[PDB]
Design a protein around this ligand. Structure first.
Ligand SMILES: [Cl-]
Ligand SMILES: [Cl-]
Ligand SMILES: [Cl-]
Ligand SMILES: [Cl-]
Ligand SMILES: [Cl-]
Ligand SMILES: [Cl-]
Ligand SMILES: [Cl-]
Ligand SMILES: [Cl-]
Ligand SMILES: [Cl-]
Ligand SMILES: [Cl-]
Ligand SMILES: [Cl-]
Ligand SMILES: [Cl-]
Ligand SMILES: [Cl-]
Ligand SMILES: [Cl-]
Ligand SMILES: [Cl-]
Ligand SMILES: [Cl-]
Ligand SMILES: [Cl-]
Ligand SMILES: [Cl-]
Ligand SMILES: [Cl-]
Ligand SMILES: [Cl-]
Ligand SMILES: [Cl-]
Ligand SMILES: [Cl-]
Ligand SMILES: [Cl-]
Ligand SMILES: [Cl-]
Ligand SMILES: [Cl-]
Ligand SMILES: [Cl-]
Ligand SMILES: [Cl-]
Ligand SMILES: [Cl-]
Ligand SMILES: [Cl-]
Ligand SMILES: [Cl-]
Lengths: 168, 168, 168, 168, 168, 168, 168, 168, 168, 168, 168, 168
């Protein structure tokens, strides 16, 4: 992530040409494109920095971690569903509840992208709030994962294994 | 701002392709785009320098200072009009006058951008010449800012404070 | 090749703009474009790496070696046909057979691009599988090329020369 | 400057998207665009090198020098046309003849650009081959420029000054 | 600190021998040990990363700060219990409440360690969730510590000093 | 990986001690332990290199790619079974076949570890040879993954999508 | 290996002289020698690279591994023949089969050099194809060597040991 | 290309011995060999530098470019020969005429080497001057190649394609 | 001595595994080992610093100097008791007295190690307090050594020499 | 080989724990383990250096050289045994006699390890002194090897070849 | 110095040409030459190492020292042969005895070279083993040289000077 | 000039092979070549230094200066003999005399090389001793050159100029 302010003159010309094309292709938004064209041509620094703030980052390992959490709960729920006596293990406890909108919006956004766009885990119960847990869940999932990955087998888990993971 | 003359061949190819697409989208200007396409393909250095001259720079801090000066006049004017007592302060002195066209062109442009494009400060009395002061003002404004920001309350100024500011 | 994850913010904006333009030009595929736009804007690292995987490399020297092998077989086949007569050399021996789909896919792909897109060597007998030899050939061809280029004349080969080449 | 083979994956993706867009806009040439898209996507080094050869360079100073030579002939010819005794100074010797098509192609290309595209020196006599002098002129013009710029005044030249220049 | 993936072959062999020994000593868990032995012997990068996540860090200064906060509450509460007019200073406000289980887990873990394992501050009231305050406290405690350490004497505090601290 | 030959003297002592302990714990195998103890103590370089050869590596990204390929086949097989109906797509096409024992042994080994030890993908039809495809697959799977990840939704695939993937 | 294109002028002269001497000694092949002399003297870069391709490398450790594999099979076969009796271990299992001509040509070539030129292992049953296994073996042999060198004694192996080795 | 003057003493001894051998092998030229022996032994610097001038260089890409030009004309001539109406396209225009002896002797020498020694393109008409064009042809061929390689197919070219290439 | 806090994750894992094995071997101390296991797994920095404080250092040269001082007293005592003449030298002065517990603790420890563990100097008269001098002695001993080693014969000293040594 | 004195605190703790375990596992040697534990904990430098002297080094090439010497004598003896007239070649001369205990103990130790532990060359006559030659043999074997490896075939050697090797 | 494995491709080609020439000149040994040609062409690392061992080094200073020792004995023996009372100084003690064949082979080799090839010190008595002293002499001779060169005159030595030298 | 002692083992091998070939070609000198072969194979440093001393150096500029001095005398002599007037200039003074054998040996050698081998200046009056001046002349010649080259015409000198030159 290098800043737009550091872009080269060639990159400025490339962008400028795109804004001119976008006005041709989408005249309803010419006001926006002409404004951006001015910012880029004149090199208005405040507005260029404000452009940086439109680009985010979610590291590859963080993405992978969020997916692994969902896989863990698939593992937990399958294992649970296939128990005989479910030892008072409440189903709500082997259900992925997601992440916090205030504090973990990047994570929650990623969950929604994996389900709604990529179409993964479409059988998971989102609740009535689309995986907003409304309390932070990151550090807790990290404890669960540490226990889960320490099981000598991660799928077809015993009730005890399930309890150790949900309890972490 | 790295010169267009230092662009990579991938960037030349990207620009070349844009000029072709621009021709497709806006055939009426085919001559203009074909000319630019030739300059970029042939790497005509003189014309590439001329392209560089189309791209300006207004540093982020300078944009912020222009905005601050306008905010300062908002404070001064709101303070002035709220003075129960008069002290016979002229309104022209508590009114933002703008920048010098001849030697402050980047600054006057930015004011006009902030007003007409971003929509900020639209209640300010523009010039007879749309914020073209005609005297150089940067140095002055700087003196006024230094005083304004030294007031422990920057808004709802007293007449003493108003006068300290405009006199700097 | 530098990874998409290292791209600059100007490059993210160029790309984002492209996906916006592609939606305007081809709303049928807006789902595809919007998804990519999101990956680029939010900087989703896992999906960005996946994008990396769409981009191959076949070094120039490797390209040239594949063409050289085809040229070698041209030389071999003309030489073998022009033989006052041919000393029980089977024509299959002096016929370019191609590359292994499984372990030599990039090489096979280039063969097909050179014949099918560039139009070179169109008179070569393609396989019953369009130059899929179904066994690795790269190492064999290198041994053949070494003998071929050691022949003081490389076209109009003697049957001794032809045999030394094919038995390499 | 950086060969196309050095382009980043971001630049490859940008180029690939342009070929997709150009196909949407200009389906008659879809073959050309798809071929390029393949080269860029697969990283076919030999074809990427060939792309490099489409891009030239003519240094800013060399551009200026070509223009200066034309201006010199303008100075010479105007000067000649106010001489009373034009001596036996032939007009052809104060006529810009151009550059060698075979060995000075980039220089001849730029003269043609300057006259035909930019519209400068349109009153110059182009002769019978559009400023192709058919013999190398660069070194000669350099000798002439050296004498011309050593004149304390460069316009309204004396006949002595003219002969000194053209004989250089 | 160095991930397990960076360990030397000597360290791998040491770890492999430990798993062999642990199997000799604890054959009931041979499955767990043999699985780890495989991961280490084969260098399975993904499982080695997962091992990394079993190891945490809590910087020496952060440990000391947690202890200091507890000591501060000790100072406050002792001080409060020798006040004549305890003002309407509620005892709960000079009671250490702990840390947030969800967002300050490492901090809550350390309090619990210090009390339950090291046996310090055993007379502290742990409340109804074993020092889980259920809301982030770190920043608050930092403000309190700042006032407390600015007292010329930190023990046998005045009511004014107490209120200054707790209101921080 | 750093070679056992580069180990420090502290590491040699740790290892030597281990072999001594293993003899105490498992005198049945004292011959093995004592031999290793001698190699380490005397620093016998040839045998130390041989020890190096016991330690493999399979990079984390490689691990993840193998799992991703299995997940791709899961997606393909569910999609193919959920088809309102299936357009003569043979199920063998959408069945994970594994890796080549001869040239892909590390990959095959990981597949087996993930199924047999971790318990993942236990419902996959293993071969008549437990995922030994008996022909190289790595390159094929990469081509499939590239198509799969370019599908805006990756689960619940259309038969067009399924075909594009399998024919890659 | 440094390329012939980087050779010094003294090295070009040494080489040129050699080709001159070879012509004097063997005028029958003067055409070959003179051609090489020209390539070296004129420094024809393409043909010089072709010369590079005549020179292989097989690292010393690789040489030694091939010999070690043959020695392993010697140990296996003697052990298997000396068995008081043999537990249905097929002799083909304990017979060195060689390397794959297609993908393992350097290895196969060294096997043949060691037997046919150095005279080592002349009692080994060569193939029906002189140690061309016609399938890749390098990875298999490495797995076998790892087991063999972990045997405290490597000659006079038990049938358990023999089986562990061959099944690796 | 490092100079003979920088050669090491070992290289001097090697050369000296070769000159002694060459006198034995070719006594008719002993005068030459004894002279060179003296130059090398005494390290006569002027004469050593004069040796440098016997070694040339023609870069690999330049070699490849010259061959590609010949291939282009093979492409042009085949395409031409297979037209129905050859649209007044003069055969002399799709015939490779070669290079200039004065200015491009290295290039012309390479053409002669490829045809006379390597035996390639033996069906090309050399003219009566063995591919001496007697005017510079390099920059022009570069234009032709740029057009040729921009054709979406390079062989079996239309008349228009042929005209665009020959016209460049 | 690199701090425990800087240990690698492989070293954390090694230590963790030791504490588990220690529990297996010495279950009575399970609480102590489990505590250390937690410190190491969680990376509790304060407790890890405390671990560092358990490890000391006595430089090799300092150990050698302690031993030399004891050897010096052996020489002095053997010399003294061999004096035919008396010269009334007290035996206490020719008897090694040890080191100061309070400020020379590392030194007194090493004497006690050398005597009680290594078994050296077991005939020396230990203290009433086992070589605890109670006055600091290092500096003194250093003065005595300097004199002793300046005697051309270090053993079978004269009374003059003995006195020179003890008086320093 | 880095010294024990440079070991890290983590390595000290690892060693300390091993000595505590070893006392549990081998109480008869607790005296030794407790002593080493003290040395490591207190960092007694003299004793730590004395630990270094327990670790040796025999480079991989030296190991390989010793084995090659034994192989050479296998080669010599087989060749000899298969001669018809053994030309007064004394069998003692084609028998490996080993190395010198005083001067070459590392080498002799390696021979004994290869035969007694690894079980190689078990048919060799050790003499009555287990391969102690009692005179240095290293430099001589180097001469033998140089000759042996210069034979164009190393096995099935003529009598002359045998004599040249034994004579070196 | 640079091992053969490091040689450049130019050096490989030079060596290959020599083997070809040596075969032309000495066809009786074609087998030897062709074998070496193969090793060099294929870059067989193990055989290239073996070539390295054919080349030794004896530093210039070590050569000079050997000669100096001989000269010293010349000085001693001449000096002895002009003594009147030769004391009971035995002549054998002023006779150069040589060097140890087993441990000082390079030194013994050089004496033999100097006497037998260069013809120096031919009047020296070589004894019964051609200057093989059968015991290491290097260190002794160094002590002698030290005394000899400390004589203010080194020739026409006194008997005292002689005994001082030989007793060194 | 890097010493022979620093040659690489490839260069030792090349030299060794030359001495073998030299023996084949010139068997009468076998003793001389075998001696050199031994020096090079054994790396006898003293004899290798002696080889270095066989190779000289005469810098290019020094060769050029010698030639210039001879050219200067050509100019002087041609000028002298063309003097219509005499001015009684002696011919000896306008005649090149050569260089000093004792202290200018490299210079006299080069003159003799230029005359007798290159054939330059063959009309010059050689000495009674073939250009051996017997007085050192370099410094003188330098003075004469400085004057000669300061004459604006270097040939067809006047008597004034001739005298200025010879007198320097
Ligand atoms: Cl589920
Ligand atoms: Cl674009
Ligand atoms: Cl306002
Ligand atoms: Cl207002
Ligand atoms: Cl005020
Ligand atoms: Cl044909
Ligand atoms: Cl870019
Ligand atoms: Cl230029
Ligand atoms: Cl004009
Ligand atoms: Cl005019
Ligand atoms: Cl360690
Ligand atoms: Cl922390
Ligand atoms: Cl308390
Ligand atoms: Cl209290
Ligand atoms: Cl399914
Ligand atoms: Cl057998
Ligand atoms: Cl043709
Ligand atoms: Cl351990
Ligand atoms: Cl004593
Ligand atoms: Cl005593
Ligand atoms: Cl004394
Ligand atoms: Cl044997
Ligand atoms: Cl060389
Ligand atoms: Cl030496
Ligand atoms: Cl003598
Ligand atoms: Cl004598
Ligand atoms: Cl040679
Ligand atoms: Cl003359
Ligand atoms: Cl003359
Ligand atoms: Cl004059």
């Amino acid at each position: 992530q290098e800043s737009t302010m550091e872009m080269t003159n060639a990159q400025r010309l490339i962008l400028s040409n795109q804004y001119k094309m976008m006005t041709m292709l989408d005249p309803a938004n010419a006001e926006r494109y002409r404004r951006l064209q001015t910012i880029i041509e004149r090199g208005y620094g405040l507005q260029m920095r404000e452009l940086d703030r439109e680009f985010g980052e979610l590291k590859e390992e963080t993405c992978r971690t969020i997916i692994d959490i969902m896989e863990m709960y698939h593992a937990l729920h399958v294992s649970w569903s296939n128990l005989q006596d479910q030892q008072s293990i409440d189903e709500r406890r082997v259900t992925f509840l997601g992440f916090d909108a205030a504090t973990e919006a990047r994570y929650l956004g990623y969950v929604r992208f994996m389900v709604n766009v990529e179409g993964r885990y479409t059988h998971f119960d989102a609740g009535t709030h689309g995986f907003n847990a409304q309390t932070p869940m990151w550090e807790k999932y990290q404890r669960m994962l540490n226990v889960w990955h320490a099981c000598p087998r991660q799928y077809h888990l015993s009730a005890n294994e399930i309890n150790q993971i949900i309890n972490a």
